[PDB]
């Protein structure tokens, strides 16, 4: 079989959202309304591609 | 009965029996191939029906 292709550690690097779940829960309703577009593009990618490597951007 | 009727009655009997014998040999050969290769209507052992599969988007993406 082939070699499983994996992205480099640098390719995986992003600025994380380092807030707690209570912060996320409190903001969740407004966050869902304001950030719908990029979130829905990401979720369409994940369900169509079925591969996390294909949706890193 | 005269010899002609019995003679030509024999030929009719022989034709039927010769035809059945050839078909019997052909059926055995056909059965041997179908059972060996599985490409015929016989010895067709069922596999799982693929209409049972659910193609809806699942609770998680990777599947």
Swiss-Prot record, chain A:
Q: What is its main location?
A: mitochondrion
Q: Name one GO cellular component term.
A: mitochondrion
What keywords appear on the UniProt entry?
A: Disulfide bond, Electron transport, Membrane, Mitochondrion, Mitochondrion inner membrane, Repeat, Respiratory chain, Transport
Q: Does the keyword Membrane apply?
A: yes
Q: Which GO terms describe its biological process?
A: mitochondrial electron transport, NADH to ubiquinone
Q: Where in the cell is it found?
A: Mitochondrion inner membrane; Mitochondrion intermembrane space; Mitochondrion
* Motif mapping: Cx9C motif 1: 35-45
**Disulfide topology:** 45-55
Q: Where's the CHCH domain? A: 32-57
Keyword Transmembrane helix belongs to the record: no
- Tell me the subunit arrangement: Complex I is composed of 45 different subunits.
Q: What is known of its domains?
A: Contains four C-X9-C motifs that are predicted to form a helix-coil-helix structure, permitting the formation of intramolecular disulfide bonds.
Q: Which family does it belong to?
A: Belongs to the complex I NDUFA8 subunit family.
Q: What does this protein do?
A: Accessory subunit of the mitochondrial membrane respiratory chain NADH dehydrogenase (Complex I), that is believed not to be involved in catalysis. Complex I functions in the transfer of electrons from NADH to the respiratory chain. The immediate electron acceptor for the enzyme is believed to be ubiquinone.
The protein here is known as NADH dehydrogenase [ubiquinone] 1 alpha subcomplex subunit 8
Task: Please tell me where this chain falls within the complete protein, as first and last residue plus total length.
Answer: 2 to 58 of 172
Curated annotation (Swiss-Prot), chain B:
| Cellular compartment(s) | Mitochondrion inner membrane
Where would one find the signal peptide in this protein? none
Listed under subunit, the entry gives: Complex I is composed of 45 different subunits.
The free-text function statement in the UniProt record for this protein reads: Accessory subunit of the mitochondrial membrane respiratory chain NADH dehydrogenase (Complex I), that is believed not to be involved in catalysis. Complex I functions in the transfer of electrons from NADH to the respiratory chain. The immediate electron acceptor for the enzyme is believed to be ubiquinone.
Q: Which family does it belong to?
A: Belongs to the complex I NDUFB5 subunit family.
Supply the name of the protein. Answer: NADH dehydrogenase [ubiquinone] 1 beta subcomplex subunit 5, mitochondrial
Per the UniProt entry, what species is this protein from, by scientific name? Bos taurus (Bovine)
Q: Supply the source organism's classification.
A: Eukaryota, Metazoa, Chordata, Craniata, Vertebrata
- Its gene name is NDUFB5
Tell me the part of the parent protein that is shown: 127 to 189 of 189
């Amino acid at each position: 079989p082939g070699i499983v292709e994996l992205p480099s550690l640098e390719d995986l690097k992003v600025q994380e959202v380092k807030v707690s779940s209570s912060v996320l829960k409190a903001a969740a309703h407004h966050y869902g309304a304001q950030c719908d577009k990029p979130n829905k593009e990401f979720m369409l990618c994940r369900w169509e591609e079925k591969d996390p490597r294909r949706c890193l951007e | 009965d005269g010899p002609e009727k019995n003679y030509e009655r024999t030929m009719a009997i022989l034709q039927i029996e010769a035809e059945k014998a050839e078909l019997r040999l052909k059926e055995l050969e056909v059965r041997r191939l179908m059972r060996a290769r599985g490409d015929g209507p016989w010895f067709h052992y069922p596999t799982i029906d693929k209409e049972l599969i659910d193609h809806s988007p699942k609770a998680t993406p990777d599947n």
